[PDB]
Design a protein around this ligand. Structure first.
Ligand SMILES: NCCc1c[nH]c2ccc(O)cc12
Ligand SMILES: [Ca+2]
Length: 223
């Protein structure tokens, strides 16, 4: 997260770190046994880390739970990043508490101008590299479909939205992938892609979770 703030320990209780020997993606806990992330975060050998603030120190609220199954959206296209969503089932249920909590799926799609919270452990610089150890947060609005299409001509599908700032300086970045965009206490987006980080006229692009609620619910019901 570029141009964000330090969230504060366990203030984003649905935020997960996907770990394969090191943090490589974020995700969101949507019930005690399931995580939502980006399809571009897919790999085998995932450990889900819940209750994290500093990902390099054991602070005492963590739960580390292996993935039993990963389900990439059936229509994910790695070239276009259309349908950039995946579900991860945990081997055992998380213990839910004030610091490890699920985020609700949306019943409706959020409108342009809605303020959201984006979070992650990704890079904090728009040029060069500095990876924070503690969770970073950014408040950002959802942009109009027309401003998003104007920023990324020919690349925005009905399964994507833009959020952030056309002036630059504030955005999700590398390592924030798969993490949550939460608006009015609902999961509306997943950190998906963009042209670099925090560049002028190049806001972040997010998977539009409201389009996937039936797939999520039917997949969880049967797996
Ligand atoms: N808006 C940040 C999007 C993002 C997701 N993953 C990324 C990887 C590299 C990068 O430059 C950017 C990204
Ligand atoms: Ca920790």
């Amino acid at each position: 997260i570029v141009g964000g703030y330090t969230c504060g320990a366990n203030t984003v209780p649905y935020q997960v770190s996907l770990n394969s020997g090191y943090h490589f993606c974020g995700g969101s806990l949507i019930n005690s046994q399931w995580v939502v992330s980006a399809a571009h975060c897919y790999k085998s050998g995932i450990q889900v880390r819940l209750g994290e603030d500093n990902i390099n120190v054991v602070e005492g609220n963590e739960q580390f739970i292996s993935a039993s199954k990963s389900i990439v959206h059936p229509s994910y296209n790695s070239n276009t990043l259309n349908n950039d969503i995946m579900l991860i089932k945990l081997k055992s249920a998380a213990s839910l508490n004030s610091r490890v909590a699920s985020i609700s799926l949306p019943t409706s799609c959020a409108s342009a101008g809605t303020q959201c919270l984006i979070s992650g452990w990704g890079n904090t610089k728009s040029s060069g590299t500095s990876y924070p150890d503690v969770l970073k947060c950014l408040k950002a609005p959802i942009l109009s479909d027309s401003s998003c299409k104007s920023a990324y001509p020919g690349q925005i599908t009905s399964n994507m939205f833009c959020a952030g700032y056309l002036e630059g300086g504030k955005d999700s970045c590398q390592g924030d992938s798969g993490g949550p965009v939460v608006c009015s206490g609902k999961l509306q987006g997943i950190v998906s892609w963009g042209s670099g980080c925090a560049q002028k006229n190049k806001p972040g692009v997010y998977t539009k979770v409201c389009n996937y609620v039936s797939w999520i619910k039917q997949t969880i019901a049967s797996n």
